[PDB]
Amino acid sequence: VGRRALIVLAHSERTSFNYAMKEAAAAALKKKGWEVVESDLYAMNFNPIISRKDITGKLKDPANFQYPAESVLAYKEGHLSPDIVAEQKKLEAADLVIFQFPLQWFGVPAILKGWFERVFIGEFAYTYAAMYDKGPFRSKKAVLSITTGGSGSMYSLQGIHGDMNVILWPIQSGILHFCGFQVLEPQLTYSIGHTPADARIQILEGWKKRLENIWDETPLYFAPSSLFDLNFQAGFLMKKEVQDEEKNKKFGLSVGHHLGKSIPTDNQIKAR
Amino acid sequence: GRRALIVLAHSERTSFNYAMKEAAAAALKKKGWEVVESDLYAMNFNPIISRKDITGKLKDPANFQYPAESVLAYKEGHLSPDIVAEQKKLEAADLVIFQFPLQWFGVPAILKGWFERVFIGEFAYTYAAMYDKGPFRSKKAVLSITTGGSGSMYSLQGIHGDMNVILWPIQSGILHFCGFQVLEPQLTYSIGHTPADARIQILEGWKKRLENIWDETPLYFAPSSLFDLNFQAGFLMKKEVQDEEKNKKFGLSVGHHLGKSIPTDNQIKAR
Numbered sequence: 001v002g003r004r005a006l007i008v009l010a011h012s013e014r015t016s017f018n019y020a021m022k023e024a025a026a027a028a029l030k031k032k033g034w035e036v037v038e039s040d041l042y043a044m045n046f047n048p049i050i051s052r053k054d055i056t057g058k059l060k061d062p063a064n065f066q067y068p069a070e071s072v073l074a075y076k077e078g079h080l081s082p083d084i085v086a087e088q089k090k091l092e093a094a095d096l097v098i099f100q101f102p103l104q105w106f107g108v109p110a111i112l113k114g115w116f117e118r119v120f121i122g123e124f125a126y127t128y129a130a131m132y133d134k135g136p137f138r139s140k141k142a143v144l145s146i147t148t149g150g151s152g153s154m155y156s157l158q159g160i161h162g163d164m165n166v167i168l169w170p171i172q173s174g175i176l177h178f179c180g181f182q183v184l185e186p187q188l189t190y191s192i193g194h195t196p197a198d199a200r201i202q203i204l205e206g207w208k209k210r211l212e213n214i215w216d217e218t219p220l221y222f223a224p225s226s227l228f229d230l231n232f233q234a235g236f237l238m239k240k241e242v243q244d245e246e247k248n249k250k251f252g253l254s255v256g257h258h259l260g261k262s263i264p265t266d267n268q269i270k271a272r
Numbered sequence: 273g274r275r276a277l278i279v280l281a282h283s284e285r286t287s288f289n290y291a292m293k294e295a296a297a298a299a300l301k302k303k304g305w306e307v308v309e310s311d312l313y314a315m316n317f318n319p320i321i322s323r324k325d326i327t328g329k330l331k332d333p334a335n336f337q338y339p340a341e342s343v344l345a346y347k348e349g350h351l352s353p354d355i356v357a358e359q360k361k362l363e364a365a366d367l368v369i370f371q372f373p374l375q376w377f378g379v380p381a382i383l384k385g386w387f388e389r390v391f392i393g394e395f396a397y398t399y400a401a402m403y404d405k406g407p408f409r410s411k412k413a414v415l416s417i418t419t420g421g422s423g424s425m426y427s428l429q430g431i432h433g434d435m436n437v438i439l440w441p442i443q444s445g446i447l448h449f450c451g452f453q454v455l456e457p458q459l460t461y462s463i464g465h466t467p468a469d470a471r472i473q474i475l476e477g478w479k480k481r482l483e484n485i486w487d488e489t490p491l492y493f494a495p496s497s498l499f500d501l502n503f504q505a506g507f508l509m510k511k512e513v514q515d516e517e518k519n520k521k522f523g524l525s526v527g528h529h530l531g532k533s534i535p536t537d538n539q540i541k542a543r
């Protein structure tokens with residue numbers, strides 16, 4: 001038939017280049033015969049604050065409210081707030097997920113952060129047995145499309161802000177890969193504010209071009225979960241035999257698993 | 273008598289995060305600090321940047337840019353009063369404590385929004401005055417964080433990976449960027465599986481530390497003096513400094529690893 005794509009957009013202005021990148025993605029994907037659903041979080045007045053209101057049933061312990069435990073119960077017995085569930089169904093359906101957002105304070109905008117917090121509930125998006133490469137969304141692929149006010153030099157190894165790979169790690173590993181997503185090379189659009197109109201149109205066409213073969217791309221390297229002892233006991237530590245194999249190597253595995261050594265160049269930006 | 277701001281991001285008064293706020297205020301008050309609070313949930317604080325944050329005339333309402341418009345609102349003084357009230361607390365405060373649970377490898381959305389709406393240009397940063405030269409270089413800041421997962425999980429060989437990488441974007445990107453001296457974070461691991469007597473220990477430990485918090489050594493960030501601070505050179509590290517560092521085995525910090533090893537616990541323990 002065709003596969004299905006979810007575009008999540010975090011920008012308030014329809015005049016923005018971020019909006020322009022969303023439209024370009026939908027157009028390009030539709031023309032290749034994808035089905036495209038959107039979550040324009042500002043347009044939806046999406047609520048980013050986790051609270052008791054997210055559960056519309058009886059709480060297990062209302063005297064001691066714990067969002068993790070209560071939210072999982074609500075998922076299982078199916079009395080989550082419908083706004084959460086509607087988003088959960090878009091995700092269940094979608095094969096590719098594009099996150100389009102400007103970099104704000106070295107991370108995702110608050111509204112998108114809240115989306116993750118409310119939508120990526122336990123049992124739906126992760127367990128504990130099933131983390132990282134064994135997680136629920138291992139059939140799916142995800143990609144960050146980001147814009148910055150600062151130039152790329154600033155985010156280079158010798159830039160004032162420091163390595164962009166470090167900045168992407170918490171999002172791409174901690175949120176996306178944790179839940180199982182294969183994470184594709186991020187689409188990084190630097191210093192957009194100082195870019196003339198002809199050059200922006202180029203970037204849009206560049207984005208559209210990439211999306212024609214997005215599914216066939218090689219994803220980023222994360223350390224496989226099979227390198228670790230996955231139980232409470234060993235403390236989710238890297239297996240002793242694997243530590244012995246890596247001891248002699250000059251490079252670490254990833255940005256997080258640098259193991260006190262050098263970080264593989266552009267670990268979070270380019271695929272091997 | 274100095275002032276302290278405690279920023280708290282947790283909805284429940286029954287939480288350990290609230291308990292840790294209360295212990296901080298008590299301990300600080302007893303040593304004669306003035307303590308102002310921002311309990312963001314209790315305030316029903318709004319985390320979403322919008323046009324509504326400017327209560328005057330927009331420069332260009334047809335083409336709205338929050339950075340430019342918010343700076344003009346600051347200077348001419350027609351920001352939303354909720355934003356301004358928080359900005360005053362910051363102006364006054366010498367120490368800022370951020371008390372929050374780790375959610376998805378970062379700050380909760382409500383605290384993220386606070387940073388987005390309150391840390392406006394000219395107030396909190398320019399890009400003439402970044403990092404060590406920034407507006408809040410007289411002030412000190414400290415993260416107090418709690419996790420569900422155990423510390424092993426966030427160790428060099430842990431499944432989640434190095435905690436230093438996780439803190440970097442927050443402690444460097446937000447706090448130090450604006451000028452704050454950042455103190456050793458207070459990391460409280462796997463709090464839900466800690467027995468009652470041990471939690472009392474942690475509280476007493478927190479209170480003890482706060483008695484001499486001002487005298488502490490802050491974390492090492494690369495000084496701005498190592499870089500050429502203008503558009504032309506591209507805010508790159510100076511050629512002479514690159515030559516100095518070429519022979520060294522370790523990088524400067526987590527973000528300035530320079531393709532080399534990261535100094536151990538750069539974002540967790542002070543030099």
Ligand SMILES: Cc1cc2nc3c(=O)[nH]c(=O)nc-3n(C[C@H](O)[C@H](O)[C@H](O)COP(=O)(O)OP(=O)(O)OC[C@H]3O[C@@H](n4cnc5c(N)ncnc54)[C@H](O)[C@@H]3O)c2cc1C
Nearest residue numbers: 015016017018020102103104105106147148149150338388
């Ligand atoms: C709270 C906050 C925190 C921030 N933190 C950071 C940070 O940590 N690091 C950092 O680097 N930056 C930061 N920024 C800056 C931010 O990254 C930029 O403002 C943002 O990336 C700009 O993207 P945009 O889509 O809004 O651009 P816009 O300015 O909306 O768009 C660029 C230009 O393209 C034009 N345009 C729109 N549509 C089209 C089209 N179809 N064809 C051609 N031209 C078009 C627009 O009119 C405009 O002139 C921050 C900003 C805020 C508000």
Ligand SMILES: Cc1cc2nc3c(=O)[nH]c(=O)nc-3n(C[C@H](O)[C@H](O)[C@H](O)COP(=O)(O)OP(=O)(O)OC[C@H]3O[C@@H](n4cnc5c(N)ncnc54)[C@H](O)[C@@H]3O)c2cc1C
Nearest residue numbers: 067117287288289291373374375376377418419420421471
């Ligand atoms: C959306 C989301 C994302 C998350 N992401 C992550 C993540 O990426 N990594 C991670 O590690 N964790 C994560 N967590 C888990 C979260 O970090 C923990 O639940 C939180 O840090 C625990 O703090 P709390 O105050 O809520 O604990 P609580 O359970 O409220 O408190 C802990 C215990 O202390 C007791 N207590 C309360 N007050 C006192 C007192 N005065 N004296 C003694 N005992 C007291 C309580 O009764 C309870 O038994 C996430 C949670 C959510 C909801």
